[PDB]
Amino acid sequence: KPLPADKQIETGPFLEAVSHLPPFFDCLGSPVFTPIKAVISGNITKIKAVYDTNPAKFRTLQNILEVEKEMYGAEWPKVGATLALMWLKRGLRFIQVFLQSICDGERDENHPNLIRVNATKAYEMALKKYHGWIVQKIFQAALYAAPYKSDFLKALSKGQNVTEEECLEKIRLFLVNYTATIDVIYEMYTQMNAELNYKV
Amino acid sequence: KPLPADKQIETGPFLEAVSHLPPFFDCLGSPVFTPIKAVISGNITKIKAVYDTNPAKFRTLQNILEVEKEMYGAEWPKVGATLALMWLKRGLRFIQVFLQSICDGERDENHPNLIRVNATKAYEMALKKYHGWIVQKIFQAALYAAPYKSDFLKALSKGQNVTEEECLEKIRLFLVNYTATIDVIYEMYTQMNAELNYKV
Ligand SMILES: CCCCCCCCCCCCC/C=C/[C@@H](O)[C@H](CO[C@@H]1O[C@H](CO)[C@H](O)[C@H](OS(=O)(=O)O)[C@H]1O)NC(=O)CCCCCCCCCCC
Ligand SMILES: CCCCCCCCCCCCC/C=C/[C@@H](O)[C@H](CO[C@@H]1O[C@H](CO)[C@H](O)[C@H](OS(=O)(=O)O)[C@H]1O)NC(=O)CCCCCCCCCCC
Ligand SMILES: CCCCCCCCCCCCCCC
Ligand SMILES: CCCCCCCCCCCCCCC
């Protein structure tokens, strides 16, 4: 759904929406992506657990950061749902940049059947800042398991079997409100000084 | 707790016990192990979700396999809690073999400060059969992140700071009922023809 004019992101609906994302990792043709599915689902579960404690107090994502800042003092933002959402958003941004790169026709002219270049750009823009050497090396190894472009687009078409062109048009439309929402989440972290820059 | 004479493993208590395991992965000094934590926690969550549907019908692990065999016909055992426990047990066996290898004094004489040889033996005995090439390569990369032996033993001592010798004695005692329990789970899969041998 489009953002409301005030740009507040309702937590409940957000959680319902993002919970559709992990199952797509089971559509990528490689069990290599199972642990990624699980880590993202863990972030979502942690945010849901906090929300469920008091759905009014945590009605919006903005409320989560505001309330937790007040609740946790010196340990914040490296705590609670603020931390879980900090990581979740990085995964959401990876997906944004990846999909946008594919839709924008970016490709390796000698491997046009792969999506490695798109995944690498997304990784650099969303995650690499926060990863040490061994994690980067595992990402590089995992790229071998990334699906062929055609197979990837087939994972997104609801089985239906449309053309690549039709699939990409649907992704382009999806990206409008998706990108807008992720941008608001990033803005909130920035404006609240809630972003951390430690490496894993 | 020791096995009852009839060797039935009560599901509730089992779930309570195994839920202590994922947090140990956060004590290993490397965020590389977070996705492993998450995958194991996912197995546990899936078994708990089935159990919670009907705690009497699923009172024991044996009941889970028996009931699901009857519930799911041709799709079983690649379904439900049977599948989740099939994978969980492989992780439990890895931990068994790893700990036992350390306790038995197995080491690489030119890297006695590492636990790579112990992890490799555990991997070979518990998981490698079920992993294709890229997953094996990721395991090998991840070994770089494995803690030094001293640090690993410090993760198990409840903070306390005992000698390595004391830590290993405690692990040896732990392994008695742990190994017995995992052996019963493996036996159940074998006797029910519930084991699968597909690779990921
Ligand atoms: C052998 C086969 C298997 C396996 C593995 C293959 C792929 C592995 C990719 C390597 C990169 C991730 C490895 C490490 C991940 C995690 O360590 C980090 C931080 O994870 C966070 O850590 C926090 C504490 O600092 C809290 O515990 C968070 O927990 S919480 O409780 O606060 O919620 C937790 O998520 N998450 C990350 O780096 C985020 C990664 C997002 C990934 C987005 C999709 C990427 C798609 C890539 C396509 C190639
Ligand atoms: C960049 C930094 C990060 C990341 C990654 C580092 C380590 C990665 C290790 C690679 C091996 C695991 C990679 C793949 C894992 C998973 O694909 C498999 C099957 O996973 C199962 O799949 C089933 C469908 O077939 C169901 O979906 C199960 O879901 S369910 O819903 O049925 O419950 C699901 O668990 N589990 C496995 O292979 C089990 C692995 C157990 C591991 C035990 C501890 C190992 C300790 C090793 C010490 C070195
Ligand atoms: C190698 C990276 C894989 C990224 C997984 C993307 C899954 C989410 C895609 C959601 C887009 C839905 C568009 C509707 C057609
Ligand atoms: C590199 C493999 C790491 C294995 C993680 C083991 C965690 C579970 C250990 C439980 C043993 C508890 C003994 C009590 C002192």
Numbering used by the authors:
A (entry chain A), B (entry chain A): 10 to 209
Paper text:
Human glycolipid transfer protein (hsGLTP) forms the prototypical GLTP fold and is characterized by a broad transfer selectivity for glycosphingolipids (GSLs). In human GLTP, a glycolipid headgroup recognition centre located on the protein surface enables selective binding of the GSL head and ceramide amide groups via multiple specific interactions. Encapsulation of lipid chains within the hydrophobic pocket involves a cleft-like gating mechanism that results in two glycolipid-binding modes. To elucidate the structural dynamics of the GLTP–GSL dimer and associated adaptations, we comparatively analyzed nine novel crystal structures of wild-type GLTP (wtGLTP) and the sulfatide-specific mutants D48V and A47D/D48V complexed with N-lauroyl-containing monosulfatide (N-lauroyl-3-O-sulfo-galactosylceramide; hereafter referred to as 12:0 monoSF) and disulfatide (N-lauroyl-3,6-di-O-sulfo-galactosylceramide; hereafter referred to as 12:0 diSF) in different crystal forms and compared them with previously studied GLTP–24:1 monoSF complexes.
The GLTP mutation D48V near the ‘portal entrance’ of the glycolipid binding site has recently been shown to enhance selectivity for sulfatides (SFs) containing a long acyl chain. Compared with wtGLTP dimers, all dimers of D48V mutant are locked. Compared with the wild-type protein, some interfacial regions in the D48V dimer contain noticeably expanded intermolecular contacts. The first region involves the α2–α2′ hydrophobic core formed by residues Pro44, Ala47 and Val48 with their counterparts, as was originally found in the D48V mutant complexed with 24:1 monoSF in the sphingosine-in binding mode. Since the same core becomes the major protein–protein′ contact in the D48V dimer complexed with 12:0 monoSF, we were surprised to discover the sphingosine chain projecting outwards and entering the partner hydrophobic pocket in the sphingosine-out binding mode. In turn, the lipid–lipid′ and the lipid–protein′ interactions become weaker in the dimer of the D48V mutant as indicated by the reduced number of interatomic close contacts, which are reminiscent of those encountered in the sphingosine-in binding mode of 24:1 monoSF complexed with the same mutant. Only ‘closed’ conformations characterized by a very narrow range of θ angles (62.6–65.5°) are observed in different complexes/crystals. The extra monomer–monomer interactions arising in the mutant and described in detail in the next section stabilize the closed conformation of D48V–SF dimers, which we therefore refer to as a ‘locked dimer’. The diminished monomer–monomer′ contact areas of the D48V–SF dimers imply reduced stabilities, which decrease despite the expanded protein–protein′ contacts (1300–1310 versus 1020–1090 Å2 in wtGLTP), again emphasizing the importance of the bound ligand for GLTP dimerization.
